[PDB]
Assembly symmetry: none
Homo-oligomer: 286 residues x 2
């Protein structure tokens, strides 16, 4: 079992570093060959990790982990013809729930990613966590055993939908507020912001229910409690994106919840307003 990671961003690089320690043939792939500086934690000693360009790959892989941004997914797909074979397990180490439809392979899996860090130029700094939550099946189970000497934590879920929706909602509240606010978590000091944040999660909660899940006001509480644990100066990925004038992962997150809202013909005023500012940002950035 051979393993490639596509997308030398923060998540992809962490996964590659950690897997490479016990599984040295594990390949990190991007657009161009290069060397990346990686820090397991801020101020730890520098480590080198090699990136291989698509052109440079000569073999196929039994497992492919895709870790680009959600909006970069389509650009990756055509390379899978040269990297994958028919039975290749394709794991999406990506936020939200992406355009899986677009991926022409038997074995595709949206993971839920709990791995934090940042990329700045060719420098990646990991912060905390090494976790991937994936659908239980014989392929993912085989992968979990392969990685048992690493600290990458593969959690196999009987039904991955719930895990996906839960993280959708954790992102929905704080990412939306910090990005549209152009502010760090400090923005949560405003009581009107906290109320909005709560209402936004209830909107998402109502969509989750319509999709089959027993999320409740209590679920909302646990999320608001996760948020209180955040420090004031913490940003979010979507906040960072908006501030550096980059595209957003909106379509796979807020966009995904919005589309499921219209499908079930629901009333989601907070979600709609947040989604429309986000979308309008995308259209201008583009």
């Amino acid at each position: 079992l051979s393993v490639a990671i596509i997308g030398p961003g923060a998540v992809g690089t962490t996964i590659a570093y950690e897997l490479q320690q016990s599984l040295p043939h594990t390949t990190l792939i991007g657009r161009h060959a290069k060397t990346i500086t990686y820090y397991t934690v801020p101020h730890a000693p520098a480590q080198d990790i090699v990136v291989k360009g698509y052109e440079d790959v000569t073999n196929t892989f039994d497992v492919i982990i895709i870790a680009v941004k959600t909006h970069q997914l389509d650009a990756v797909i055509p390379h899978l013809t040269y990297l994958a074979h028919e039975d290749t397990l394709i794991i999406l180490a990506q936020n939200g729930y992406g355009q899986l439809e677009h991926i022409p392979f038997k074995n595709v899996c949206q993971a839920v990613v709990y791995i934090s860090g940042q990329k700045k130029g060719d420098v990646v700094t990991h912060f905390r966590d090494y976790q991937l939550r994936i659908q239980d099946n014989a392929l993912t189970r085989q992968f979990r055993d392969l990685v048992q000497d690493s600290q990458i934590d593969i959690v196999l879920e009987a039904n991955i939908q719930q895990a996906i929706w839960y993280k959708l909602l954790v992102n929905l509240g704080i990412n939306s507020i910090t990005a549209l606010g152009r502010q760090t978590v400090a923005i949560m000091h405003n009581p009107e912001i906290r109320i909005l944040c709560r209402q936004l999660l209830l909107d998402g909660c109502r969509v989750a229910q319509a999709e089959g899940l027993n999320f409740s006001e209590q679920t909302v509480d646990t999320i608001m409690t996760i948020y209180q644990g955040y420090p004031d100066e913490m940003g979010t990925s979507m906040y960072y994106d908006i501030v550096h004038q980059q595209p957003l992962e909106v379509e796979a997150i807020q966009g995904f919840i919005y589309r499921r809202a219209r499908e079930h013909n629901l009333d989601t005023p907070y979600l709609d307003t947040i989604y429309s500012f986000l979308r309008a940002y995308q259209q201008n950035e583009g």
Copy 2:
């Protein structure tokens, strides 16, 4: 005898136009200076003098205050010197002003439809020259005194309706341009058009609770006013937010918002817009 306090985009437009028919009209600000003024974009540049408060030592028969909503209190003590007891004081501002706050007996709120911008000491007027003011004896005199100018004075039987209409006109386009950090072109997004209608509808729902007969069709007339704005046009609240200034939020969105809570309404769109604008405002005041 006429003075304008507030050499911003609105004040400067009023002073320039009134100076065309009544050349003694005085533009007043914190310090003496020369504004460059354009009657329309790419027009020939003209200079307009501003007197400092301290440079003036006469009273006026009419004073048009055209400062930002949050700047009004700092103007008031100057009025003690610039106005006499019967001076007609016109508040040419956005929002729903508290005329009791100004220590004079002849005080009127004007609803302003005059579009332009100030960059440095350079004012460019875009479109429109209209003030809507409550009809009464003094105010008819002002209209007549001023009838020679391009300033279009509309006298209203009941000004409260015009005020509430303007609040809604602001509510929609200003909130969306400012939060969008975009010019008026942001309104070409289909999802932004829907949001703007819903948000205006929350505004109508507040207006109704305050005794005004506003409906879905009031929203239509507001939306068609928006379609006459060129893509490149920004709004006052958009310029303020972009230049990292304090906003007029508390007099506009904040006011509608507080009315909404006073009537125990459900106003999700309004509440969400307010929450972001207020958050911007608190951050600005905390790091000022």
